[PDB]
Design a protein around this ligand. Sequence first.
Ligand SMILES: [Zn+2]
Ligand SMILES: [Zn+2]
Ligand SMILES: [Zn+2]
Ligand SMILES: [Zn+2]
Lengths: 339, 339
Amino acid sequence: IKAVGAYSAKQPLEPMDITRREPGPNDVKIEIAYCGVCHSDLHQVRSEWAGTVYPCVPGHEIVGRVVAVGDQVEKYAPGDLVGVGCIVDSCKHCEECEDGLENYCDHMTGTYNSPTPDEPGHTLGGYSQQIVVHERYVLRIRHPQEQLAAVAPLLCAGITTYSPLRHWQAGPGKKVGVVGIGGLGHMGIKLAHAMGAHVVAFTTSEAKREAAKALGADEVVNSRNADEMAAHLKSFDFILNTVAAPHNLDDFTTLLKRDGTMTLVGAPEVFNLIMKRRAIAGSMIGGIPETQEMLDFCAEHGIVADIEMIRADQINEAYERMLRGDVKYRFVIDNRTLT
Amino acid sequence: IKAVGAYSAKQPLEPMDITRREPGPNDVKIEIAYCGVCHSDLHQVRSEWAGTVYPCVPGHEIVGRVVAVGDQVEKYAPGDLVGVGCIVDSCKHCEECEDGLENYCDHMTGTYNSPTPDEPGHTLGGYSQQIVVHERYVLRIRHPQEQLAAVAPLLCAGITTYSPLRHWQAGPGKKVGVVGIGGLGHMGIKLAHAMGAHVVAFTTSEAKREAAKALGADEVVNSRNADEMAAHLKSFDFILNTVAAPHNLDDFTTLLKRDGTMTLVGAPEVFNLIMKRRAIAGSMIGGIPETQEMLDFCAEHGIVADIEMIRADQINEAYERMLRGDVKYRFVIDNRTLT
Ligand SMILES: [Zn+2]
Ligand SMILES: [Zn+2]
Ligand SMILES: [Zn+2]
Ligand SMILES: [Zn+2]
C-alpha cells in the first residue's frame, strides 16, 4: 500500500509503503480516491510540539469506494461511495460517544497520529491508497461520483464549520458572520448561505472582497476598516471565526448582539462580554451522526468545496501555497497518482 | 436631602446636600434606610476613566420604605419595604426591555452617573436620605424588617451572581464553581448552594478556606495548588468567576465539562475552548423581573448578605478595607447617620 509521509519534522513528505489491518467483522476496507489537504496535516508533519509519531502519514478528508466489508457490517457494501474524516474510533460508551459526539471523546482515535493495535502502533492517514475503518466512523457519500474530489474537504473543513453553524442555530432570520476566506472560511460562507442565514464575510484585505461575494456572502467587510466594522455594531447573532491566528477579537465581540456568541474553529476585553452577556466559544469538527447529516444536506443542495487537484508528490509545494493562502480554496490529492 | 459624594476623582467622599425631583404619577418616593457599598462605587469616584460626572454620589444597593407614591403607581403604597438596584430607568421599548432585561438596554439609566432631566443633570445614588424612582424599577422586599440592612447587598452583589446562576441553570445535579470569596463571591456561594448545586469555591489563599466552607461551599480549592485543581479536571457544568482581576483563566477553562461555560462578573488558550466546545461569557446584574424573583427567593429561603454596618462618614475607610478584602463580606451604610 503506497502512501506519502514524513520521517521527521524537518523532512519533506516522501513516498513510503505502509500496511493496513485485515478487515475485521465491523470493518470497511476503502480504496481511497481523493484526500483533501488540511492545515492540520501541515502542522502535524512540521510542528515540533505536535506530539507527532513517525513515520507520519497525514490526511483526513478522505473519500473513496468500499472494496470489502466485514461480516458484521450493516451500513455498507462493496461499491459504495464513502468518506472518512478526522475520527476512526472512539470509546463508544462515554457521554460524548453516546450523544453522537465522538469528536469530543477523551479517547477518540484520530485518523492519524493516535495509538492503535495496528502496525506500526499509531494511525496512518489518507495520503495513501487504502484505509480500513470501523463502519461506525465511515460516512456515506450521496453526491454524484463525478463530484467525489470536491466532496473530500467536507470531511473536515466542511463539518468543522457546519457543526457550529448548526449548534448556534444559523438559519433564516439570523445574521451570521464568517471571519476568514480560506479553506474553512469558504465552507463557512457556502454552508451559512445554504442554511438561509444573512451572511457577512470578513477579510483583512480588499483583494478577497469579490471572492467572498462569489462564495455566497450577502455582505463583505474589510475588518481593517473601522468604518466598515462600525456599521455592524451589535448586530450579529453568531460569528464563526475561522482564522488560524485571529486578531482584534475585541472588534468582533462588539459586533455581537446581546447573548450573541463568536466561536473560533481555526488552528478579548472582558468588558465587552459583560455588557451584553456575550460569549467566546470554540468547536472542533463534528460527531459522526452530524457529519452524515452534513453530507446528506450537501448532496441534496449540490454543495461541494472549491478545489485544486494535485498529484501526491506535490503536497510539499501545496503546503507552501496554503501558508500564503494561495489556493481557491482547498487542495485535493488525486490518490491514483500514488502509483 | 443629605448625602455623601465626591467633587473630583482625588477628593474623598464628603457631606453634601442634593435635590430630588417631586414624585411624578409613576414615581415612588423612598426614605433610604441602608445602602450597600459596591466596588463600582469606589471605581466611579476614583477611576480617571469612568466617565464620572461630578458631584458624584454613588450607591446602588438601596433598601428603604415608601414615603409617597404617584397617582398612577399600582405596585406600591406608603409603608412598603422596597429596594432599588443599579437601574432607575430604561427605554422600555427595545428587545431587551421588553424581555425583562432592562440591564442590557443600550439606553439604561444607571442609579448614579447617568444623564437625567432631574437636577443636576446626572443621577445621584443611594449614599443619600431619599431617592425617587419610577415604580417599574422599584423592588418589593419580603424579608422581615429586622433584616433590611442585610438585604441591601442583594440589590447588586446578589442579582449579579443570581442572574448567571439561573441563566446557566445551576441546580441539583450540577457541579458549580464560584471563584473569589469577596462581596460577589460570598453571594455566589450562598445562592448556588440554595439553588441546590454542588458548589466548589476557589480561593488563592489558605486563609479563606474555612470561610468558604462556612458560606455553604461543599468543597474548597486553593487555585494556586495544581494538585487541588487537577482533581477537578473537566468536571464543572458552570463556573462563576467573581474576581475583579481574574488570573489563570486557562486553569479554570480546563475544569469545565464539554459544553461548559465560565462566566465572568467581576469588575485564555483557544485550544482549551475548541477541544471541548467550552465558552467564556460575561454577565452584569440582572433585569428587574429577575431581581424581584431573586428577592422573593431569598425571602422564602432566609438568604441575606453577611454585612458590617458603618456610618455614612466612614465610607472612605470602607473603600480602603474593601481593596484589601478586609470585610466579611459587604459594608452597608446606616443612612440614618447622614444626620
Ligand atoms: Zn482537518
Ligand atoms: Zn467516548
Ligand atoms: Zn454594584
Ligand atoms: Zn431599552
